[PDB]
Paper text:
Nucleosome assembly proteins (NAPs) are histone chaperones that are crucial for the shuttling and incorporation of histones into nucleosomes. The human malaria parasite P. falciparum contains two nucleosome assembly proteins, orthologs of eukaryotic NAPs, which have been previously termed PfNapL and PfNapS. PfNapL and PfNapS do not interact with each other and unlike PfNapL, PfNapS is able to deposit histones onto DNA. In the present study, the structural basis of nucleosome assembly activity in P. falciparum was addressed by determining and analysing the crystal structure of smaller NAP in the parasite called PfNapS.
Author numbering:
A (entry chain A): 29 to 168, 181 to 217
B (entry chain B): 29 to 152, 157 to 163, 183 to 191, 198 to 217
The structure:
Amino acid sequence: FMQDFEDIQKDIEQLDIKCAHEQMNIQKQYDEKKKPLFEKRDEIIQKIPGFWANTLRKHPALSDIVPEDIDILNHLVKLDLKDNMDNNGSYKITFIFGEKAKEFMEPLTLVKHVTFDNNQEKVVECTRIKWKEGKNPIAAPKWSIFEWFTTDELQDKPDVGELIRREIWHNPLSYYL
Amino acid sequence: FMQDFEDIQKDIEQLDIKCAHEQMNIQKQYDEKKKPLFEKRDEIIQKIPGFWANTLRKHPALSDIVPEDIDILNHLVKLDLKDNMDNNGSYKITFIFGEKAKEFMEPLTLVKHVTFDNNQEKVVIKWKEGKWSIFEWFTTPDVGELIRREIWHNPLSYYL
C-alpha cells in the first residue's frame, strides 16, 4: 500500500513528463517568434536618451546605487537577456556601451553567463572591467551596480541578473515610467 | 517612440497570452488523463491513517505548527488541488474533513481559492467553544503554495 502509492505516482509523473514536453515545444515555438520583437524593441531603446540608466534605478533594489553608476549607464546603448539556454534556469546578460564610455572603462561589451547546479548559482563567464584611472565608481547606504560583474558570490548584494530576468526584461517600459 | 515601445510590448504580451493559451489547453488534456489517477491516489490515502496530517508538517515550513492543528488535521480525509484555472495561474484547494471533525468545526468541507488577475492577487469556519494555526491561513507561511508548488504533485515524498 505504501507500494500502491508509489505505483500510482509513477503513472502520474509519467503523464507530467509528457505534458511538460509538449508545453516546452510550444514554449520554444514562441521564444523564437519573440526574437524579432525583442530586436525591434532594442531599436526603439536606441532612440530613447539614456533609457536603461533611467530604467534600472527605478527598480527598488537598484534605486540606491552610487550616482557615479549613472555616468557610465547613461551610455548603455544595449542590454540583452539570452534566457532559457539550459532547461535549468540558465542565462547570459550582455551590456553594450557606446564609444563615450571609453572615458571610464574597457571593454565596451560586458558579459555575464550564469548556470545553476543544486540551486546554487555558478558564474561560467564574466568580463573583467578595466576601469580607467580615477574613473571606477565601485570606488565611492550604497553599492555600485557594476559590482555585479564578479565571479564571486553576491551576499546581501542585489542579484542584478535575476531582477533583470524575472522582473525588468519582459517589460522595461513599465520601469521607464 | 513611447508609442512604438507601448506597441511592441503588446505584440510581445499577446504572443505571451497565446503561448499560455495553447500550453494550458495541453495542461487540461493531461489534467483529464490524470483525473482517474488522483481518484486512486485519494482512494489509497484513505487507507493510510492520518496521511495528510503527517505529510504537511514534515514540510519544514509547517514544522512549526501548534499541536491543536494536528488534532484537526488527523480528521482530514481528502485534500485536492485544482491548479492552473486561468491564464494567470489561479488555483482552488479543497480540504474535506471527516465527521469526527464536527467536534471542532463546521462546515466539514473547506474550499479556498486564490485568484490572480493580470498582475496581482485577490484572495477568499465557525469554531465550537473551546477550539500559528494552519487554519489561520483561512483568513483573507504561504501554505497554499507550499501545497501546490511543492507537495501536491508527489505528497508521498513528504510522508516518507
